[PDB]
Design a protein around this nucleic acid. Structure first.
Lengths: 25, 99, 63, 215, 64, 136, 84, 126
RNA sequence: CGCAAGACGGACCAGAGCGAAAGCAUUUGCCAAGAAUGUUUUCAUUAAUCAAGAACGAAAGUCGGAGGUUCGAAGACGAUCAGAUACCGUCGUAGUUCCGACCAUAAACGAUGCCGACUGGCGAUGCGGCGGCGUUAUUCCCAUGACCCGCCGGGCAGCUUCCGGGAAACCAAAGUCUUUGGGUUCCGGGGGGAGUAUGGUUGCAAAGCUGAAACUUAAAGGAAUUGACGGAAGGGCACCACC
């Protein structure tokens, strides 16, 4: 199911990027 | 490309149809996709009947039938040889096998 | 099956008469006089017909 | 228990049926003979026997089963009474088939005696002898009209009778034959039976009424 | 516990069985009561009307 | 031993319960009410490896062991009740079912009526193995 | 239909077979009839697809009953159509 | 093993029987001599195989027709089933019954007057 | 043999019915709603399709109460194996059931907007109406139920054909198109980067909606034909195969 797993991989990367940027200011 | 005109299912004029669990593997599939087989047999085999009729206490008795209804998914029906694959024109025949 | 031996026709008709119903005590005895399985004559056909004609007289069923 | 030959300590007893049935001997059964605080009759009472009607009546009908209970022990005899009736598994499996309607009903009722009974009834639609169509289905209002007639006839026969007259109707099953006659004006029916009876409650022990069913 | 030897006569040969075709499948009729018959599997070369020796009569076998 | 003191011209009946599945088979004979046990023997008492416990041969050997103990205790005829596992599961009898029945006939017991007794739900709790089934 | 049947002259058995709105010119299947009963004999007029439980001038309790199609008469002496 | 006969044998045997039916018979040793003088055959071993199938075909032709072979003796009795049979001296006679709707069809065609009549069942047979 | 608790409605069950879709199967009663048909009832253009705005919306998931039979993410162990954080087995938390608030997604599929007209044949099937010779049931007719033979509406579908269309597979519509115009809503423009970054907005959270560019590339893709190949199926053969 590679497209469903590429979608899951992007969601966890975006959750990391969310928490990283919103801490800065 | 589309393989079957009926999508491999009986559903026309409906949204949802309830599932059933298979008699071999307990996989979950729709009641109208499942492959049916109703089996009627004697409790005593055609070899054994004579040995069990002569020890009977009664002057007349008739040995009972056993009734079972079976449900398969496509993978179990193919692997257990209940159904075979067919030629592109032969797939259209809806009549059951000869006796 | 329907009747396994024609003797067990009377052993049925006697039970509807014990319950007090005469119509279903006929029909049993009618088919047993009218089925190809029991067309060879036997001592039990007299007791059958002697019960049958008593019921046809008492219910006044001439046909 | 690790007894050496416990079958040396067992007494055989006879089992006797109610006086309605044409053959009155059921068979034989075991119990351990009496010891301090453990009497043999307390082990024999309350046992259930299930018997084919063809062994109570010496016909071939075979497919009705009757249940009997032990109530008291007299000498080497155990005395029994009615507890229910049922149809054999292979009979009911042979009736339910495709392209037909199946109709069922049930009631709770009392006799003129104190017994409370629960009854179940079944019937199936009939293929007419000229029919060229493949299916014999009834419409929903025809099914509702038939079910009211099943309950109406089935309650009428129990309310005004005792357990003696109730069992005399169940032996030939005149109940199912009267339902089958009445419904032919709504939709013809081809198999019709009282398929099960359960007993829910019963009166005091009453030894005189027990012996009236045995003398 | 113990049971006796039985003798039986071959009345028909039915085919060959086993992974390499090693065993013949055969019908036999007993030497005492000539109304009885069963089917058996046999290891060697077999011909119609041979007499076999059975160490048990009660066992019967289909297609291994 | 002691059966009934009558021993000529008529039969003494028991009930035989045969429970035949995959994995094992039971042969178990009782009093006519079902409350007292006379004897019980199983496929796993006759063989010495787990593959063989459901076999036709183990079931024949268990039935011959039961029928000798019946005659020794004075029973002469049997009613038969047959089971497969039932409930959510397969409800077809296991492979040892046919062999036990003929083996108690061939060893001299008289045969009464025979019944199928497997338990069937009107509808049931959820069956084991998940939505994708057991996969092999 | 063949390739050449003319549309201006349908036979009366071709016209009587088809739906009331799909004829060449429209016409109803319903009609008026005159009805009469025992005990009081004043004749009255009724419509064959009536919705009303009609009471006659003779004051009998039912002349006809309504139904999903034609109304049914209570065994009255006439079902005769009026001609026009 | 395999004893099936190839088309070189089967075609040569048919052509011999079409031309020389009056010379042939059931004796292999006489057929073997006839086939050597009416035909050029390159090998003794091929001559024996041709006379063998000719001997098989003669024993079939004594019972009935063989679809690939024709002879005057069998054609002239076919020509006697052709033409007219000994069966009857006149046709099956026109005195036959009529159903009421055929009587009405003939009435509109200005005909009838020579047929008996009866009606069918009350409702369509099932 | 008898008691208790929580979940579920087998067989009958079908290319059958109902609903805007998601969905809907034990009995009996109560409340409000609806399609088609019948009609020589009545109003008289009141209609079609839709930015903004609004109701409903499988399963999983979140918050607060009650319950907990069966099954079972995470987790603890037994096997298998080079390893096995998996497939197979034993046990089990959250959840799976009910009540009250949230959430707005799906291969949510006929991968196929809605309204209207026209263009071949045939046999069935569910509902309402119309006509007809017999058989069967209740009361003695009549009326009415079960069956049988036709006709008319509108419904879920099937078979057939050189209607015609198409790249073909196939389609009575996916037809009436270079002989190109019945009305009207949404929406695509070679393959990737990408449903990503950034701003707005809704949410308790998970997340939903809206949504780029720099840069990179000669093909990526659809339908069908002949080979080769399969731990796919069916026949047949060989001591350079096996018994």
């Amino acid at each position: 199911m590679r497209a469903k797993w590429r979608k899951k991989r992007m969601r966890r990367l975006k959750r990391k990027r969310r928490k990283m940027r919103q801490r800065s200011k | 490309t589309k393989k079957r005109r009926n999508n491999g299912r009986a559903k026309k004029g409906r949204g949802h149809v309830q599932p059933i669990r298979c008699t071999n593997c307990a996989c979950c599939v729709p009641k109208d996709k499942a492959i049916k087989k109703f089996v009627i047999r004697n409790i005593v085999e055609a070899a054994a009947v004579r040995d069990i009729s002569e020890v009977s206490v009664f002057d007349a008795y008739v040995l009972p039938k056993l009734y079972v209804k079976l449900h398969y998914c496509v993978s179990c029906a193919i692997h257990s040889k209940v159904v075979r694959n067919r030629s592109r024109e032969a797939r259209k025949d809806r009549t059951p096998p000869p006796r | 099956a329907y009747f396994q031996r024609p003797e067990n026709a009377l052993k049925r008709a006697n039970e509807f008469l014990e319950v007090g119903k005469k119509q279903p005590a006929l029909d049993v005895l009618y088919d047993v006089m009218k089925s190809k399985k029991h067309r060879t004559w036997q001592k039990i056909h007299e007791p059958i017909m002697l019960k049958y004609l008593e019921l046809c007289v008492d219910l006044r069923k001439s046909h | 228990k690790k007894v050496v030959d416990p079958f040396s300590k067992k007494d055989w007893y006879d089992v006797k049926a109610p006086a309605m049935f044409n053959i009155r001997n059921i068979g034989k059964t075991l119990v351990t003979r009496t010891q301090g605080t453990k009497i043999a009759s307390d082990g024999l009472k309350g046992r259930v026997f299930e018997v084919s009607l063809a062994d109570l009546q010496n016909d071939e009908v075979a497919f009705r089963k009757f249940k009997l209970i032990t109530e008291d022990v007299q000498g080497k005899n155990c005395l029994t009474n009615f507890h229910g009736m049922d149809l054999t598994r292979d009979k009911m499996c042979s009736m339910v088939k495709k392209w037909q309607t199946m109709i069922e009903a049930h009631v709770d009722v009392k006799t003129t005696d104190g017994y409370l009974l629960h009854l179940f009834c079944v019937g199936f639609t009939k293929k007419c002898n000229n029919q060229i169509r493949k299916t014999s289905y009834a419409q929903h209002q025809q099914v509702r009209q038939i079910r009211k007639k099943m309950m109406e006839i089935m309650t009428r026969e129990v309310q005004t009778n005792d357990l003696k007259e109730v069992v005399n109707k169940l032996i030939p099953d005149s109940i199912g034959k009267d339902i089958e006659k009445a419904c032919q004006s709504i939709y013809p029916l081809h198999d019709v039976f009282v398929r099960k009876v359960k007993m829910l409650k019963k009166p005091k022990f009453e030894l005189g009424k027990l012996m009236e069913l045995h003398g | 516990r113990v049971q006796p030897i039985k003798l039986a006569r071959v009345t028909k040969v039915l085919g060959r069985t086993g992974s390499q075709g090693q065993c013949t499948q055969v019908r036999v009729e007993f030497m005492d009561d000539t109304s009885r018959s069963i089917i058996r599997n046999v290891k060697g070369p077999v011909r119609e009307g041979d007499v076999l020796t059975l160490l048990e009569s009660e066992r019967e076998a289909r297609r291994l | 031993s002691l059966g009934p003191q009558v021993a000529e011209g008529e039969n003494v009946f028991g009930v035989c319960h045969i429970f035949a599945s995959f994995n094992d088979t039971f042969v178990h004979v009782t009093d006519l009410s079902g409350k007292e046990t006379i004897c019980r023997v199983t496929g796993g008492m006759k063989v010495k490896a787990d593959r063989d416990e459901s076999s036709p041969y183990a079931a024949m050997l268990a039935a011959q062991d039961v029928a000798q103990r019946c005659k020794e205790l004075g029973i002469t005829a049997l009613h038969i009740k047959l089971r497969a596992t039932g409930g959510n599961r397969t409800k077809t009898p296991g492979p040892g079912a046919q062999s036990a029945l003929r083996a108690l006939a061939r060893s001299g017991m008289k045969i009464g009526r025979i019944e199928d007794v497997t338990p069937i739900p009107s509808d049931s709790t959820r069956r084991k193995g998940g939505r994708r089934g057991r996969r092999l | 239909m063949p390739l050449a049947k003319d549309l201006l002259h349908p036979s009366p058995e071709e016209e009587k077979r088809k739906h009331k709105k799909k004829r060449l010119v429209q016409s109803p299947n319903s009609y008026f009839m005159d009805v009469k009963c025992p005990g009081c004999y004043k004749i009255t007029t009724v419509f064959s697809h009536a919705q009303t439980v009609v009471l006659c001038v003779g004051c009998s309790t039912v002349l006809c009953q309504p139904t999903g199609g034609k109304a049914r008469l209570t065994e009255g002496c006439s079902f005769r159509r009026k001609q026009h | 093993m395999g004893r099936v006969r190839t088309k070189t044998v089967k075609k040569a045997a048919r052509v011999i029987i079409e031309k020389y039916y009056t010379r042939l018979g059931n004796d292999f040793h006489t057929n073997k001599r006839v086939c050597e003088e009416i035909a050029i055959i390159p090998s003794k071993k091929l001559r024996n195989k041709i006379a063998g199938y000719v001997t098989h075909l003669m024993k079939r032709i004594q019972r009935g027709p063989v679809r690939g072979i024709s002879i005057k003796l069998q054609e002239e009795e076919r020509e006697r089933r052709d033409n007219y049979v000994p069966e009857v001296s006149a046709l099956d006679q026109e005195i036959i019954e009529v159903d009421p709707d055929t009587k009405e069809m003939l009435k509109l065609l200005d005909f009838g007057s020579l047929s008996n009549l009866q009606v069918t069942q009350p409702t369509v047979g099932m």
